[model samples]
Target chain A: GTILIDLSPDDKEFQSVEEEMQSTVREHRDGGHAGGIFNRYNILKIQKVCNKKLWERYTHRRKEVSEENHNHANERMLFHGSPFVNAIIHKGFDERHAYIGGMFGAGIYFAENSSKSNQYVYGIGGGTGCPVHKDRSCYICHRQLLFCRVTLGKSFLQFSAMAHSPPGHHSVTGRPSVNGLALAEYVIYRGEQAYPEYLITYQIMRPE
Target chain B: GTILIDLSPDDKEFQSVEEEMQSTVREHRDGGHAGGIFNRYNILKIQKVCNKKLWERYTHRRKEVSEENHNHANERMLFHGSPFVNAIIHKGFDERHAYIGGMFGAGIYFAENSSKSNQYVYGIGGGTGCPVHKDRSCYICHRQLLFCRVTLGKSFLQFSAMMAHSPPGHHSVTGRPSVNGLALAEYVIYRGEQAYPEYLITYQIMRPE
Candidate 1:
């Protein structure tokens, strides 16, 4: 017996394309040789464990607060209070392009200085737009990219870099700015964590 | 104009006794012979300076709500958007008698396991009512004194001995039960430089009787 098949009216070519893309990407190896072997999977696992441990420690330490101690620390008239203010992440910026392109891209570094030292690093890697070609028209001149890096110090503070895209050419000309769009970008490499330390402690400056 | 006038109150005898009581006690040598003089004036002057300097440092160091950087070394966050809640001396039994008798007193130490160690010291002293005899009474009570000694290490880290009252009595119960109060108190002392060596390394334990 012949069976009748009816596809829903809402189904379109784009939908079919999306479904095919989803299915093709389902197998770990099918996405691509690079995707199959990259560190995303391991990185994600490590992040999960690290985050859980951090949260557990935070809660454990917080459990020490008791009622009497709280009042004694704060309300006691004779006791002089502490002098430390809360540390906070005020702002962030990116400076990779300025470092590579020199003066024209110099504005990028200003993002870090103008905002705060909270800048870390971020990027997007090979997939849909591999080997960025110069012929490709600039889609969004000011497209921000995300970055991450670990800070070295007493506790080895890990910081996430802020993402910021410069004002687009269209916006400069007084046209409506493109609100949402993805653009080609590279991950900011801060030189294997050794560079900042060298620059800050040894290489950057010397007493007169 | 040359006539003598008596301006003293009608009760001259009573007035005389009052004046005599107020006068400094004079020391006389054997048979009125001159010897070392006893001057209460000198003693009062020395006592004033000593007490003034001590209380000045104490009061200057005391934590306050409006003061900046009022959190302990380990405190990373100001819970509930505020630096810390104020710690209050709630009970009369905790402060009344001692405050009346002495110059100053702080309640329990605000730190981890403080209750067990009784490391946090609290008391009240200083004022018109703080008589010398009463001050000695509170000071001698092993249950209320906290003697702190600190040493600096090669790494610039400090080591300290946090002494609290021994043979806990009514003072031991002065600690509040709320965690908020405890956390705030800990930060104030731990970060306030209220403790010696800029940190509290250890709290001396005192056993309850």
Candidate 2:
């Protein structure tokens, strides 16, 4: 059971959250703004009342990473796609759940493209409150996205896929595919580098 | 052996530091503004290249203290008085060196009043560069002040002095004396609760010889 405080539309943070979503959509690799297609139902802030110890581990790593990077930890709020968004909030991100043989290895992946993240979300079962979609039921009832604080220390650019962080690099940034359709994917091998800050439950109107 | 970067008067932080000094002077219990009597020569930011490990401990404690206090860390930039200011930058704050029978036990003390802190500062020896003074050579030749970030989480107000931290309190606040002449003094019992040498300020007394 995870505690998610629903944010009011008029809340001060609500506008900033809306803006980041719109901004990331503008950065879509194909120069498309598909953010409007997704109907947001809830913007929830994860409250770590139960998993205090687990939360501390991530914060401690954040401090260590910050000091190690000469005080510029370079934290960015990026999007993550997952059906088990609640699990992520409770247990924190796990690399074991990551897709094996991923382009960036088994590291946890995040993106700046809402469309790219929407691809990974799938519904566990039938759900209500979400608007209906004709083609995909999951798109309507099970769309879950994560906005996470990712500490991308010194990222090493990899022209190709990377199985692990290159020496001296804290993270890996996969180069865009030659086809120019795929966006750059950021991968952090350590789960502690990412803190799930917000969970967005929405309905995807159309498929990417 | 510590690197001190002098902040320029035109720097954005310079005005803020200047403001804090003036504001604290105004907070003097006697309604005094002796801040005009101090000639600021340099405002230095301590670069912790050598004491990285020590700095980490302090920063780590800051994070812990912040989290433990439900994220309201209650950090304050208060003044500390010491002659070996360089040693403080290297070693961090040590409670053992604190006054043995202080009004609030053996904890690191900080104050809002620069005049109150100026009482404890003493010069090492004859020094040049600082202007001449007759009343006290230390006031002119060797004046150093520290503005440190102290984590005073949930401080308990105590009118009477004690030897150690009162049960659950992270820090102690010495209540004003009944005479209404002394201002409140904040004391953190743990060394890690205080980060040393946030700013190493050098100034000279403007009093005429």
Candidate 3:
């Protein structure tokens, strides 16, 4: 029998708060009062102090040390033509397209096979066109700008490594000009280690 | 598949108090004092008031009054001969045996079954025993003594009704008069209504099948 575990972060956090509150309640019940009108009030004060301290720490770290330099640069950029296109390309699209496309295609394929009994599937993609379809009007293309032809022949372990190796290798060298080859190689190795086991199985069955 | 619902008087009372406390917490939060301090204090005060009120109500009700008298009589009898016996039964037993045997049972039971699977078991007990075991050991024993024998079948529902039906029902109206059929009939009806469904099922099965 499959038992569903509901892992709500809020529930866990509230449970800890409840334990603290209970301990405070016990202390109060034991005739120990700390000048508050009630035991729970004193505990709430403590919670407030902790929250205030945390907020201070967060805000202090985020404050700019060189405000003049920051303002001058902002003004200069405003006057001079801002590198909006480069910024958009670097921070928004080009850097994002692979992940966004991969996610979109993966989502469509997942939804298509959600009811299938087998848990494993191989998602195949090619460059610049909808990979799942030789023709334009495939269902994958209709749902996603990028598409993957998925086959349910592989186990989760096999598909996972297939997704890991190439992009896993490329991400390493992609930042080498700044971080050095050894660090890049380590990054790739770590990425490979973190790859979902199911994706590797799918990758193995794909044609090189 | 068979679900048991257990509800203690304290459990029912605590729910009323807990809701008040939660609202108090919310009120304090919304008010200007840091983290709703006023609301928290307000809730605690309310809880204390609630506890005191319940204790008084429990002691003052006619059934409770009778039970208290009986309980006191039992204590007096246990300690009648010697102060030593009185000291042991009143102080020693009150602290050690009565408390440990009564409230400790509930505490241990709660701790053992605090997990999800056991949650249903506790739910069957109707969330009554939790706070009572936490705060009031004296009340726990006082309540348990009423139906300890009756609850042997593991039917808490039957035990609850037995506790409510106090004052042994019997009276002669006058010289050569009839029995108080009203009290007798009520007792019969109450017992029949309060009896465990398991016993009814057993009787039905025994009839033919």
Better of 1 and 3 by lDDT: 1
Output the number of the lDDT-best candidate.
2
| Top candidate when judged by DockQ against the true structure | 3
- Could you tell me the lDDT of residue B25 within candidate 2? 48
Query: Where is model 2 more than 4 Å wrong at Cα?
Result: A26-51, A123-139, A160-163, A177-183, A206-208, B1-209
| lDDT by candidate, in order shown | 0.19, 0.58, 0.18
True lDDT of residue A111, candidate 2:
85
- Give the CA lDDT, 0 to 100, for residue B43 in model 3: 14
Q: Judge candidate 1 at residue B178 and give its lDDT.
A: 47
What are the runs in model 3 whose C-alpha is more than 4 Å off? A1-208, B1-153, B157-209
TM-score of chain A of 3: 0.14
Model 1 docking category: incorrect
Q: Write the per-residue lDDT of candidate 2 for residues B1-209, one digit (tens) a residue.
A: 34344444556776677566545542333222322244333322222123466667778877876787788767777877655565676577776446555566666677776655655555322212223333332332435677777777667666543135533645445434444454545454445444555776655444433
Write the number of the candidate with greater TM-score, choosing between 2 and 3.
2
**Model 2 chain A lowest lDDT segment of ten:** A26-35
